[PDB]
Design a protein around this ligand. Structure first.
Ligand SMILES: C[C@]12CC[C@@H]3c4ccc(O)cc4CC[C@H]3[C@@H]1CC[C@@H]2O
Lengths: 229, 10
């Protein structure tokens, strides 16, 4: 139910992972080490986060797994964008890892991804995305992935959940008291940005997979696993 | 395959 759902999401927010720039100037290797070390740690916390969304731990194991494998990059990126929303031309990876757009030149293939992330962030900035809208959108990202039938009521349980999240978002948007038509436009504007987030995610995944192959960066543990597919 | 994920979910 919308108010309670929204408070649960609020209380579910994962902590800020702290990381710092290395002492030496960035290289491709050292930049990738920093961002993957950050991602890996944030992944740990994303599991605990997901488990706090009502219903999530009532879905089947394969379902929880499949949603998390499918959305984790998207969720990393969404959280990044929210962190960076007030800081044009910058990506706020962590309080002490604030990358200027140009610093992406450091890593082959990454500037384009920074620009996508930056563009999607500006679009949220233009729309004046509100904290509670961000909470709902991020949970929708967890819940809204293709789930063609696997061969292993969880699917209806999924729909009910994503339904309640979508209602919560509609309810948050109602608080603005704007025109009915403009409440529809805003919903559409926020959900249409979900594709952009999926799209960046796709480029991010591919970029990192390739970095891993070229042994340009070692990846460990959770991140390594989520990567191995 | 989800050696660690399963671990953390359960
Ligand atoms: C996945 C990459 C490393 C981890 C990066 C990260 C790391 C942490 C985070 O909160 C967000 C992102 C989004 C951009 C990601 C990068 C885009 C491609 C690069 O390989």
């Amino acid at each position: 139910s919308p108010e309670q759902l929204v408070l649960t999401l609020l209380e579910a927010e994962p902590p800020h992972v702290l990381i710092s720039r290395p002492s030496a100037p960035f290289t491709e290797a050292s930049m990738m080490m920093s961002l993957t070390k950050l991602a890996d740690k944030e992944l740990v916390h994303m599991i605990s986060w997901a488990k706090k969304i009502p219903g999530f731990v009532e879905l089947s194991l394969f379902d929880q797994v499949r949603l998390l494998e499918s959305c984790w990059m998207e969720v990393l990126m969404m959280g990044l964008m929210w962190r960076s929303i007030d800081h044009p031309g910058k990506l706020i990876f962590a309080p002490d890892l604030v990358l200027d757009r140009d610093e992406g030149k450091c890593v082959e293939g990454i500037l384009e991804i920074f620009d996508m992330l930056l563009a999607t962030t500006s679009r949220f900035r233009e729309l004046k995305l509100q904290h509670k809208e961000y909470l709902c959108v991020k949970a929708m990202i967890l819940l809204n992935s293709s789930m063609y039938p696997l061969v292993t009521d969880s699917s209806r349980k999924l729909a009910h959940l994503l339904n309640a999240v979508t209602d919560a978002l509609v309810w948050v948007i109602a608080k603005s008291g704007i025109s009915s038509q403009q409440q529809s436009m805003r919903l559409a504007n926020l959900l249409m940005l979900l594709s952009h987030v999926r799209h960046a995610s796709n480029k991010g995944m591919e970029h990192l997979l390739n970095m891993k192959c070229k042994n340009v960066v070692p990846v460990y543990d959770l991140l390594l696993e989520m990567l191995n597919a | 395959r989800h050696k660690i994920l399963h671990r953390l979910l359960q």
